[PDB]
């Protein structure tokens, strides 16, 4: 067969996408998506790239991912999805870029500076 | 006074640790690093002279 591979980066995490057309089924790290996301019922947001792009679908997916919390990496899949769907055909880019899902976010945490401490709280003043 | 404590931290001691690590030039014992054995202000100031390998730029 044929396989399309594009990376996904978000929130100090890394995604190695393996996209192969099919009936549609994902097993992240040889483990199903429901077996990897707490709780969670937000995988339909991960299916939005399949709902607006390649309507309705679907393609089988295998992925290996490590680093960062579950939200940042469960959201890193979509940019690899978009890259692979653009690699498949440039037609899908017009529907992708009007909604995003390809532009990898450039926003992460910030350093820390005097005023913050063990918890991310600013200091007070001397009243009275 | 500081002058006799240069000898105090130099002479032998009754047992293992009645010592404290102070800077060789600056007499201030507080806020010193074992990697260099220089105090707070002296090592900051020598960093600006560009003598000790490494940097002061920060912003990291």
């Amino acid at each position: 067969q044929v396989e399309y591979r594009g990376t996904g980066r978000r929130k100090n995490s890394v995604a190695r996408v393996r996209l192969v057309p099919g009936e549609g089924n994902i097993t992240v790290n040889n483990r199903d998506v429901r077996e990897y996301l707490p709780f969670e019922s937000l995988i339909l947001d991960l299916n939005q790239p399949f709902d607006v792009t390649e309507t309705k679908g679907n393609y089988d997916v295998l992925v290996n991912v490590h680093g960062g919390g579950f939200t940042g990496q469960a959201q890193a899949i979509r940019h690899g999805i978009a890259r692979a769907l653009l690699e498949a055909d440039p037609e899908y880019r017009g529907s992708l870029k009007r909604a995003g899902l390809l532009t990898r976010d450039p926003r992460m945490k910030e350093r820390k500076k005097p005023g913050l401490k063990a918890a991310r709280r600013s200091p007070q003043f001397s009243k009275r | 006074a500081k002058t006799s404590m240069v000898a105090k931290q130099q002479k032998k001691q009754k047992y293992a640790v009645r010592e404290y690590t102070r800077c060789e030039r600056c007499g201030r014992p507080h806020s010193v690093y074992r990697k260099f054995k220089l105090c707070r202000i002296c090592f900051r100031e020598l960093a600006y002279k560009g003598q000790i390998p490494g940097v002061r730029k920060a912003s990291w």
Binding site: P38, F39, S41, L42, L44, D45, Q48 | -
Partner: protein, 147 residues
């Protein structure tokens, strides 16, 4: 200054829930709020048999203020029509505030009671709407020839 909405929360398929859950998540724990909101929305369907959509929509309809006041300057206060975004924000805000003030021991039953009693055009959220609509649109005399 814009809003930066949140789009999908197909649990259950709806949009107001998506904005609602983001208020109950005290100290940034979204799963607990999602679970309890789901349990409460299944409960409100269980007792007094109906669909969650009808009860929720008509409940937030009975508790959404349409006129509201704002102060400025002696002491005067201009009644002002509320934007739909701020309308729903205030509705959900006061709904959750009075669900907290209800004070029940259950994960879900307090919210079910709140929304289903609002479905009867009664309740503390309805009380807040009535109080605001009584103080407002009764003193619209002075600041009506203004913004």
């Amino acid at each position: 200054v814009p809003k930066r909405d949140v789009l999908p929360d197909p649990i259950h398929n709806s949009k107001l829930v998506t904005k609602l859950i983001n208020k109950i998540m005290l100290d940034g724990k979204r799963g607990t709020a999602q679970r309890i909101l789901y349990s409460a929305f299944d409960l409100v369907e269980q007792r007094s048999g109906r669909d969650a959509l009808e009860v929720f929509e008509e409940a937030i309809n009975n508790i959404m203020p349409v006129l509201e006041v704002k102060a400025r300057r002696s002491n005067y206060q201009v009644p002002v029509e509320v934007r739909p975004e701020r309308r729903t924000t205030l509705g959900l805000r006061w709904l959750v505030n009075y669900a907290r003030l209800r004070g029940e021991k259950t994960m879900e039953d307090r919210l079910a009671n709140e929304i289903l009693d609002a479905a009867n055009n009664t309740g503390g959220a309805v009380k807040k709407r009535e109080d605001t609509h009584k103080m407002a649109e009764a003193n619209k005399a002075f600041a009506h020839y203004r913004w």
